[PDB]
Each structure stands twice: as structure tokens, then as C-alpha cells.
């Protein structure tokens, strides 16, 4: 009964761990792509709009997208990009580990 | 009075992005107390040992900073979690 | 807490004076329309805009 | 789309197949026999195409 | 007593409660009906099982 679920969970975790590419050998672009920058800005703006904690000084600002742009400028966005290779294997680059433009 | 370790898939609000443990507790675990749950078997006395399954499998379980998967069209994060539930059923 | 300065003004302005607001979406999904309301009603709604949620199921949400 | 109503599941993929006669009868709500939809006075006829088991119809509560 | 449910007609059932919620169009549902009229089924596999 439950052991069927335990087997399925074990298999899912094993396939996930096999798909992940370890940090020491990721061969993708060091630069943040324009698509990644846009989606980081949009998602961080959504999170701020939904009352998430903010890591920058609000200069009396009200635009969530502007606040997210400020966070990206000061590299304070707690997000991670999971770049997907065609075979389903993926790498993980943190936002502060990437260079904009 | 039986311990039933369970695994659940629970959302996480952006407001609890600093203490996801408290977020999961107050979002899904507290409203699971003193209710007859159709899955575990009976009423739930409490819970203990909540663990969040990291979305990156490489990071060792020692670390306290983990990854949560954010919905593409929503700032809510979904994640698998492990917790042991104290239950009562005839 | 950073939007109430101008969202409250939009709610007071209402659906006709730009910049204004046509609806308020409550935490529990209710859609209060400002079209048929008066200035004092809109002012009461704008003043109760950012109120702390009493329902536990919606403590993670804010009005839209 | 409301950004405050997240969805947990997601359709990973779809698979095409044949709807077998057994499952069609298994899931069904009513069999349609008489080729009349509405009687006099503008009401659905039981066993007709506009049966209340097939869904609500013009202020009639669905019987399913 | 948990997995028993009723219809409007009163026909009691005991069965599938493994149902979730997704976010789809509505023309998808209409296409599903138009395919069922053709005798073709569509199985949608959800991510978390």
C-alpha cells in the first residue's frame, strides 16, 4: 500500500538526482540571458506584490517591477534559475552567480 | 494513538519566504489538527518533525537553505514535505 | 503597505475620474464593484482597504 | 487567471485512446431514448436529449 | 463512511476521490466532449501523483 508510494518517491528522487548536473561541470553561459532577466524581474515583482519580504531600501516607490529591478541592481534576489538541457538534465545557477548583459 | 509519517505536497505563500517551516505549519498543518483526515486514518492530535524536500537533489540534507519550486504563473511555491503525524482512530 | 498611498486615492476617485478604480477584490474572492456607489461609501471602502485578515484561510492574501 | 489562486497539479502529457462501450455505460448519467427534447409548456422530457441528468437547463437544477 | 457519495437521484457511490484541480482552457473541455462524441478518449496525466 504505502510501500508502493515509497518506491515511487524513491524512483522520482533518484531520477531527479541523476538529471541534475553538479556545479563543478556546468557548461552553460556565465551571462544571464535576456529571457532569464525578464522572468526573474517578473517573478520577483509578483512575490513583492504578494507581500514578500524585500531586501532593498524603498525610495518611496510603489511599482513592484521597479522594486524588483532595484533588487536585481543590488543583487538581492533570492531566486535560482534551473536551465534545462534538451534531454531533461538541468543545471542550477543562482541569480547573484550570473552577470547581467 | 499512532505515529503516521506522511508526505504531502503543500504550497508556500510569498509572505512566509523567510521561515518556510512556520509557513507550512500555519498554512497546512495547523488546519489539520483535531479533524478526521480521510488519509491517515483518524483525528490528528499533532505533528512533529517537519522536513522540506529540497528541489535541488545535489545539496546535502545537512544544509538549512533549500530550494522551493515557484509556480510559473503565481508567486506561490510548491514543495514536497515530510512530517510525522500523531493520529487516533478506532 | 507601499501601495495604499495611491490605491486608496484610486478607490476614492472611483470608476470615472482617472486615475481611478472600478472594483475591489476581497481576500475571499468577493468582487465589490464601485460603479454604483457614492463618495462616502467609496471613502469607507478605501479606509478599510488594508485591514488585517480575520479569516485564517486567507491570512496569506490581501485585497486587489 | 488570478495570481492569488495557485494550482498545484499540472497536465504533464495526454494519451489518445478508444472510449470502450463498457466504461461509457459505467460513467453515464442517463440513457437517451425518446427523440423528443421538450414537451408542451416548454419543459424537458425525461429520457430526452435535454434531460436534467445531462446538466441544468433553463432554471432547472441539474438532477445529477 | 468517508468514500461514499450521493447523486441527486440518490444512487449511492463508493469510489474515486483521487481528483485534483488544474488550470486549463474551456475549449479544451469542449474538444473533449466533441471527441467523446467520436468515441475517442483523452487521458491527461497530472504531475503530482
Amino acid at each position: 500500500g504505502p510501500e508502493d508510494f515509497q518506491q515511487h518517491e524513491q524512483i522520482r528522487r533518484k531520477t531527479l538526482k541523476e538529471k541534475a548536473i553538479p556545479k563543478d561541470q556546468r557548461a552553460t553561459t556565465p551571462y544571464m540571458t535576456k529571457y532569464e532577466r525578464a522572468r526573474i524581474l517578473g517573478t520577483r515583482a509578483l512575490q513583492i506584490s504578494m507581500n514578500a519580504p524585500v531586501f532593498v531600501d524603498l525610495e518611496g516607490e510603489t511599482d513592484p517591477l521597479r522594486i524588483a529591478m532595484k533588487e536585481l541592481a543590488e543583487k538581492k534576489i533570492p531566486l535560482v534559475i534551473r536551465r534545462y538541457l534538451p534531454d531533461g538534465s538541468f543545471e542550477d545557477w543562482s541569480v547573484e552567480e550570473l552577470i547581467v548583459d | 494513538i499512532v505515529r503516521v509519517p506522511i508526505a504531502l505536497y503543500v504550497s508556500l505563500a510569498p509572505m512566509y519566504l523567510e521561515n518556510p517551516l512556520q509557513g507550512v505549519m500555519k498554512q497546512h498543518l495547523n488546519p489539520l489538527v483535531m479533524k478526521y483526515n480521510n488519509k491517515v486514518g483518524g483525528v490528528v492530535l499533532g505533528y512533529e518533525g517537519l522536513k522540506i524536500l529540497d528541489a535541488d537533489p545535489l545539496s546535502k540534507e545537512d544544509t538549512s537553505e533549500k530550494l522551493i519550486k515557484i509556480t510559473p504563473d503565481t508567486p506561490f511555491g510548491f514543495t514536497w514535505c515530510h512530517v510525522n503525524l500523531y493520529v487516533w482512530q478506532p | 503597505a507601499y501601495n495604499i498611498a495611491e490605491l486608496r486615492q484610486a478607490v476614492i476617485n472611483g470608476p470615472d475620474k482617472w486615475p481611478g478604480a472600478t472594483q475591489i477584490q476581497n481576500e475571499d474572492g468577493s468582487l465589490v464593484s464601485l460603479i454604483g456607489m457614492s463618495v462616502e461609501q467609496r471613502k469607507a471602502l478605501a479606509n478599510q482597504l488594508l485591514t488585517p485578515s480575520s479569516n485564517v484561510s486567507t491570512h496569506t492574501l490581501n485585497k486587489k | 487567471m488570478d495570481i492569488s489562486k495557485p494550482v498545484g497539479s499540472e497536465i504533464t502529457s495526454v494519451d489518445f485512446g478508444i472510449l470502450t462501450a463498457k466504461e461509457i455505460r459505467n460513467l453515464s448519467a442517463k440513457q437517451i431514448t425518446n427523440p423528443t427534447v421538450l414537451d408542451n409548456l416548454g419543459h424537458p422530457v425525461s429520457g430526452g436529449l435535454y434531460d436534467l441528468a445531462l446538466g441544468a437547463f433553463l432554471r432547472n437544477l441539474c438532477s445529477t | 463512511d468517508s468514500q461514499i457519495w450521493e447523486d441527486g437521484q440518490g444512487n449511492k457511490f463508493v469510489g474515486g476521490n483521487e481528483t485534483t484541480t488544474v488550470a486549463i482552457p474551456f475549449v479544451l473541455k469542449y474538444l473533449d466532449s466533441e471527441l467523446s462524441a467520436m468515441g475517442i478518449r483523452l487521458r491527461y496525466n497530472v504531475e503530482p501523483k
Binding site: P2, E3, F5 | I1, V2, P5, Y9 | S57 | - | -
Partner: peptide
Amino acid sequence: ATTLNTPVVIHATQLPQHV
């Protein structure tokens, strides 16, 4: 009854162990 107050799916890890 939403994805914000209840878990999406719940599964049992093991058989219930009496304490």
C-alpha cells in the same frame, strides 16, 4: 478548500507504528 490552506496531495510514507 483551496491550494492555500490544505495540502494538494497526501501520501503515507510507512505503515502506522503504534507508540
